[PDB]
Paper text:
α-Helical coiled coils are ubiquitous protein domains, found in a wide range of structural and functional contexts. The structure of coiled coils is understood at a level unrivaled by any other fold. They consist of at least two α-helices, wound into superhelical bundles and held together by a mostly hydrophobic core. The seven positions in a heptad are labeled a – g, where positions a and d are oriented towards the core of the bundle and are thus mostly hydrophobic. We find that they indeed break the α-helices to form short β-strands, which associate into a triangular supersecondary structure we name the β-layer. β-Layers are found, also repetitively, in natural coiled coils, where they form regular fibers with alternating α- and β-structure, a protein fold that has not been described so far.
From Actinobacillus OMP100 we derived the constructs A9 with the full IENKADKAD motif and A6 with the shortened motif IENKAD, as well as the ‘control’ construct A7 with the 7-residue motif IENKKAD. The A6 structure follows the same principle: again the first three residues of the insert are in heptad register with the N-terminal GCN4-adaptor, constituting positions a, b and c. The other three residues of the insert, KAD, form the β-layer in place of position d. As a consequence, the register of the C-terminal GCN4-adaptor is shifted at the junction to the insert, starting with position e instead of position a. This register conflict is resolved further downstream by the formation of a hendecad (highlighted in pink in Figure 3A and C), so that the second half of the C-terminal adaptor retains its original register. In essence, the A6 structure shows a 9-residue element with the same structure as those found in A9 and T99, where the sequence IENKADMKQ borrows the last three residues from the C-terminal CGN4 adaptor and changes the periodicity of the latter at the junction.
Residue numbers in the entry:
A (entry chain C), B (entry chain A), C (entry chain B): 3 to 63
The structure:
Amino acid sequence: QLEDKVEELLSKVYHLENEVARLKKLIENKADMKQLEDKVEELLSKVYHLENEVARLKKLV
Amino acid sequence: QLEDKVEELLSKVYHLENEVARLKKLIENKADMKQLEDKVEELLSKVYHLENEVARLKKLV
Amino acid sequence: QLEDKVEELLSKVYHLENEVARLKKLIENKADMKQLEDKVEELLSKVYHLENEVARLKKLV
């Protein structure tokens, strides 16, 4: 019955391999943090400068 | 002592199952890249058009 | 030849441990969804309010 336990572990390993394979695919569809950071910084900067110009225009009208 | 090595692998498999389970939970809390892409594109478009209107308003004042 | 199969599983477990270790590193470089959500909400709000002020300024010029 060590055969019995080795079967058991054979099948657990098989399932783990499939689980890991699918997680790997899930991961590659997730966004990089550096990509979030860079895009948001760019947008934040453009929005900030727009706020200032709008502010200046309010003082002229 | 093949029993000894089969114990060893039993416990490594147990730990792997728990590791994989927790990574699965971590993954489901991460942002999809398509979601980052779509939101940023929308914001980028709105900001671009705002820049143009602000530009036009500067030429009128 | 149960030794033979136990070798086989020993090496599959070894490879899985390395695979899981590297995925764990990949995961920690991905963006949290709540972080995407919060940053985009903030930017969306600022853009919305800019659109309104720009709209109001167009009616004054």
